[PDB]
Amino acid sequence: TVASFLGLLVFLTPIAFILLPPILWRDELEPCGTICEGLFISMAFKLLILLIGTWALFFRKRRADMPRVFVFRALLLVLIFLFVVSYWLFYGVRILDSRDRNYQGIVQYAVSLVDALLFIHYLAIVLLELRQLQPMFTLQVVRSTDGESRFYSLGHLSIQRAALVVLENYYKDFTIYNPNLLTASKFRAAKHMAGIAAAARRRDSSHNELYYEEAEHERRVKKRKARLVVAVEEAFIHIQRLEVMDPREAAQAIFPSMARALQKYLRITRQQNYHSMESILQHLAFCITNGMTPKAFLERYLSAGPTLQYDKDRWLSTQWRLVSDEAVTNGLRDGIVFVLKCLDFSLVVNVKKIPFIILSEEFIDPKSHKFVLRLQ
Amino acid sequence: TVASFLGLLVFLTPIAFILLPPILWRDELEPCGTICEGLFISMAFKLLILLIGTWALFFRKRRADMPRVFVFRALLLVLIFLFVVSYWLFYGVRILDSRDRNYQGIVQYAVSLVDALLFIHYLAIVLLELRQLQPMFTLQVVRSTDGESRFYSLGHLSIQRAALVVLENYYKDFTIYNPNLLTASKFRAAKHMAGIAAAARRRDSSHNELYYEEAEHERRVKKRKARLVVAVEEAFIHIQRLEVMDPREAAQAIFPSMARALQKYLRITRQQNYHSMESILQHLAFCITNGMTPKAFLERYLSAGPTLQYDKDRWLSTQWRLVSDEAVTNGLRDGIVFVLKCLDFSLVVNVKKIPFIILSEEFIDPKSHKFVLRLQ
Amino acid sequence: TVASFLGLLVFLTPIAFILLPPILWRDELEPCGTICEGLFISMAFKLLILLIGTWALFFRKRRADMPRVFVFRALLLVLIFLFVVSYWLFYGVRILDSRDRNYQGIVQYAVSLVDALLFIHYLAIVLLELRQLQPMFTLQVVRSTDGESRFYSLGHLSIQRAALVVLENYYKDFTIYNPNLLTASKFRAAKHMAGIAAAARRRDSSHNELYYEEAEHERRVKKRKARLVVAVEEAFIHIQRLEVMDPREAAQAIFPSMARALQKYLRITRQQNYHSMESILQHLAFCITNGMTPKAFLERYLSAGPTLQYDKDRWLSTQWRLVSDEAVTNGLRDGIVFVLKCLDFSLVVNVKKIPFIILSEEFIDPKSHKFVLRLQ
Incomplete structure (x- = not known):
């Protein structure tokens, strides 16, 4: 490709520095003897170390598109360019x-060259995933929309990289965006607009309609849940492990005995747009295959669940928008607010400094853990 | 031991390369003078660096037994073997x-040799705990059994190492496996089998028996909880901090005034097989010692709690079984499913790719945060 | 400053070793030619790598005051001192x-010198934030006071560093210390003292007063919540996005229509000492600015929330006290208990070893996932 060709060039630069003096002036070399070969072997082993490390932490596809340029990767590529060209x-x-x-x-x-390029690899690891190991900010x-709030420690990252960690943790941790669960408030507001x-x-x-309606x-949700x-x-008890059929046909055989109750529960919890019949049968054959219980099958459908439980077209990874008052290549600091806007909701993220903490020993003597039967 | 002896050999290889020319041909050495000693000092300091780093990240007992071979540690040992033998x-x-x-x-x-062995140490850290720092998969x-579900980001790990991280997080995060809490469903299923x-x-x-029974x-659990x-x-208020007695005798003195209510609550929550009287007295003297409140003592007993709150024979760390369709030394990828089976339950783990995310700046002007008193 | 001056000295030590022979004996140097300059360029590039890495992971303010000395940073400073002085x-x-x-x-x-100082930098990263990457302990x-309990995996850290990670995670994760929520128990205990x-x-x-009172x-809290x-x-629906006013004046305009209900809810949940009117207006203008919904504004006030949602004088980062039976510079091990005491509460932290786990393959054939329609 393109980057792999430049990787091959930067890997063959030492070998190119080595092979050319024997090719271009073969008779003019002074006799090296032992030292030169004892050096070649260290060269080869360090290049093998470099190849293994570069495969381990850089032979991978790009993780995300960022609004501005990545500062540290551009710094590393400029460093490698000036390094090799010099x-x-x-x-x-x-x-x-x-x-x-x-x-x-x-x-x-x-x-x-090999040593300094190994240290460039080390500096690359320092800049990319060792700089934010120490949890500097929260x-x-x-x-x-629904106000679900979670905290995360991050290190010294830019607003771009912190926002991408926030999105990784969004698809992991936050429940999936359900606009249906948001409709009631809207209608209530509109109803107040009508009067x-x-x-x-x-x-x-006045009468608190919302308390009794909630x-x-x-009550209705718990009723549908028990149904x-x-x-x-009963639907899982209708099939024995042991006509012999695969878990797909087993799921299709036992589904009509759970279909109406599941439809009513997904409509009473407004989750019917998130579970297609094909997806329900897929997860059902999955649960039948892996020997899971009815509750293990059903916990996907009882709670809302995070975004990655659902289909791939359900999460719109492509349309995220980073809104920051300052440049997004600037690092995190105390008090900055950046907003990650999706199509209908937005992750309002405010960054605070983890405070300076002072510890001090006080010595509690195990002789001081005496107790008496008297009241206190 | 065995590995420590080979560590001593690989540590003394440079010193063995140094000391032998003065021993085997003392008069035949050309005079080095300043450079040789200015090199010896760098050698010694780099070997000290190597010793400190090897102690810091490799002088530790094995963490877990894995089904197949560890690929990266075997690669590193083969690399060290060919390195030193060459x-x-x-x-x-x-x-x-x-x-x-x-x-x-x-x-x-x-x-x-010392430089390349330091880079072998660096490559070892790269392969072992720096390759999975970037959270590639979920x-x-x-x-x-009960369907408790949690998500975890991992990097590029094999199915073995990902499964072991999953087990670390299982003993940390998931509530402890309580088969008693599973009996009701079974009986209900069997009762449907009876008809x-x-x-x-x-x-x-029909009548939803399950809703009203739940x-x-x-209601009964909350009643027992308040009791x-x-x-x-009252049992904690029966003793003053200040007959003088240690927290063990204080726990034994105040326990009969909480024993019946605690027994009834642990039977109504089916937790009586997880808290022995000796363990309850131990945790009680622990709470009396550390000045904790009744609620701080009681939160261990109110909720189910994860597996590591309980006794060491309670968690069966030895009998875990990794079930994967492919080889468990293969790395994680999107869509693979591996199952960690214990004696009665199983951790069904499916691995998804954290999606490719595209960010883009849009500029919201603070001039555009104007507002009017009119309705919307 | 002080540490920056010593950093400049340790950075200029190689340049000082280089520049002095041309200054002090200019005519006495043997002609180097090509090798010396091809070495200078590697020197300069490795020093640039060192400068970038030292900026990336050490140009930062101190994170916390610890009771005893930091063992690893003192070891590194002693190592650098003996290194450079030798x-x-x-x-x-x-x-x-x-x-x-x-x-x-x-x-x-x-x-x-440059190589060994790069390896000192590498050993510093090994000792400081790469030694605890592998989650050894829980x-x-x-x-x-309220018994809120959370688990955390840590690596090989001292009691000091583990306690500071515990405090970072305390301000992130635990709900804020509310002594008002603790008063009822106290009064109840005192009332039992009265009889x-x-x-x-x-x-x-007897009559369980606590069950019905809870x-x-x-019921009252849910009523106030719906109000x-x-x-x-209604207060958010009173303003349109589009007299033109900033979100501060918009917050002040719509606040009197939510002020009494919010005051009643914060008094019924005993959160009135944690939200000043100025802070409520600040967060209100924050929610109006970032286009958040009423529920997104209100989720800060509904639940208790962790300590970092609140004002800076609310968390007393300065007065934490580490109580350990052994020396706090000793590393973590199985069974040790250390207590982080604040002004009125204390984080009782007990450390357990993550158990030794044995995995083993068992092969479940996809031919063995057959199923029959018969009951089980």
Whole structure:
């Protein structure tokens, strides 16, 4: 490809510095003997170390598209470019033009290249995933719609990288965005639109419709939940492990005995747009295959669940928008607020400094853990 | 031991390369002078760095037994073996057989050994705990019995190492496996065994025994909980901090005033097989010692709690079984499912790829945060 | 400053070893030519790598004051001190006093210094944030007042560093210490003070005041919650996005229509000492600015929330006290208990070993996932 070709070039630069003096002036080399080969072996082993490490932490596809440029990867690529181009400049101007003797020195130059390129690899790991290991900041991430709030420690990251960690943890941790669960508030607001301290006072003196409606809805949800549990238990008890059929046909055989209760529960919890019949049968054959209980099958459907339980078209990984007052390549600090906007909701994230903590020993003597039967 | 002896050998290989030319041919060395000693000091300091780092990240007992071989540790041991054996081969064939001059070069060979062995240490850290720092995959871990589900980001790990991280997080995070809490479903299923769309329809039209039984059981659990809270509060108020007695005798003195309520609560929550009287007295003296409140004592007993709250024979760390369709030394990828089976339950873990995320700036002007008093 | 001056000294030590032979004996140098410059370039690039890495992971303010000395940072500073002082000792005794020839060797000495100082940087990262990456221990952290309990995996850390990670996670994860929520128990205990197995038996036979009082308080809290939700929904619907006013004046305009319900809810949940009117208006203008819903505004006020949601004087980062039976510089092990005492509560933390886990393959054939329609 493109980056792999440049990786091959930067990997073959030491070998190119080594092989050319024997090719271009074979008779002109001074006899190295033992030191040159004892150096070649260290060169080869360090290049193998470099290849294994570069495979381990850089032979991978890009993780995300970021709004501005990645500062640290651009810094590393510029460093590698000036590094390799300067070494070629010195090897062409001061080695190839002069057709130098004492080839052992050329071998030290190549091994210095290998050492410094290993330290470039080490600096790359330092900049990319070792700089944010120490949890310097805390990020409160709140959805703008239902207000689900979670905190996360991060290190010294830019707003871009912190936002991407926030999104990783969003798809992991936050429950999936359900706009249906948001409709009631909207209608209530609109109903107040259909119809300042004293006016609020009269609202308190009025009938709290919301309390009793929420209690009745909770009662209905628990009723549908118990119906669903009984239905799924009977439906799993209708098949024995041991006509012989695969778990797909077993799921299709036992599904009509749970389908109506599950439909009613997903409509009473407004989750019917998140579980297609095909997906329910897929997860059902999954649970039948892996020997799970009715409750283990059903816990996907009881609670809302995070975004990664659901289908791939359900999460819109492509349309996230980072809204920051400052440049998003700037690092995190205390008090900054950035907002990760999706199509209908937004992750309002405010960053606070984890405070400076002072500890001090006080010595509690195990002789001081005496106790008496008297009252206190 | 065995591995420590090989560690001593790999640590003394440079010192063995250094000390032998003065021993085996003392008069034949060319005078080094300043450079050789200025090299010895760098050698010694780098070997001290190597010793400190190897102690810091490798002087520790094995963490877990894995089904197949650890790929990366075997790769590192093979690398060290070929590394050291090749250096001995070169030192024996091309240095000892020829009884070489210019001892400074022998010192560079030894320092190249030290440098490359430091980079082997660095590659070992790269392969072992720096390769999975970047959270590449997400793992949904569901118990097969009660369906408790948690997500975890992992990096590029094999199925073995990912499964072991899943087990670490299982003993940390998931509530402890309580088969008693599973009995009711079983009996209900068996009761349906004692006695297809229309037949389910008639189930919906029937009396939902489960809803009212769950509500009544919840009521009973809350009643027992309040009894237990009052009991433990009175029992802690029966002793003053200040006959003088240790917290063990204080726990034994105040336990009979909480014992019956705690027994009834642990039987109504089916937790009586997880708290022995000796363990309750131990935790009670622990709470009396550390000045905890009745609620701080009681929160261990109110909720189910994870597996590591309990006794050591309670968690069966030895009998875990990794069930994967492919080889467990293969790395994680999107869509693979592996199952960690214990004696009665199983952690069904499916691995998904954290999706490719695209961010883009949109600029919200603080001039655009204007607002009016009119309704919307 | 002080540490920056020593950093400048340790950064200029190689440059000081290089520049002095041309200054102090200019005519006495043997001609180096190509090797010396091809070495200088590697020196400069490795020093640039060192500068970037030292900026990335050490140019930062101190994170916390610890009771005893930090063992690893003191070890690293002692290592750097003996390192640099020994190199100056060799450069003064064996190089400057003798006014040596073969300047290439001086350049190798300086580059060995740069290499070993890069490995000191690497050892510093190994000791500081790579030693605890592997989750060796689990820490149960329980507050002594309300008993909120969370587990955390840590690596090989000292009691000091583990306690500071526990405090980072305390301000992140645990709900904020509310002594008002603790008053009821105290009064109940005192009431029992105002007035042993049979006496507890009679307590069970008595009226459970706590159950019905908790149920009635829960009912009141839900009532106030629904009042508050309706109030905040109407108050947000009173302003349109589009007299033109900033979100501060919008918050002040819509606040009197939610103020009484919010005051009643914060008094019924005993959160009135944690939200000042100024803070409520600040968060209100924050929610109006970022386009959040009434529920997104209100979720800060509904639940208790962790400590970092609140004001900076609310968390007393300065007065934490580490109580350990052993030395706090000792590393974690199985069974140790340390207590982090604040002004009124204490984080009782007990450390357990994550158990030794044995895995083994068992092969479940996809041919063995057959199923039949018969009952089980």
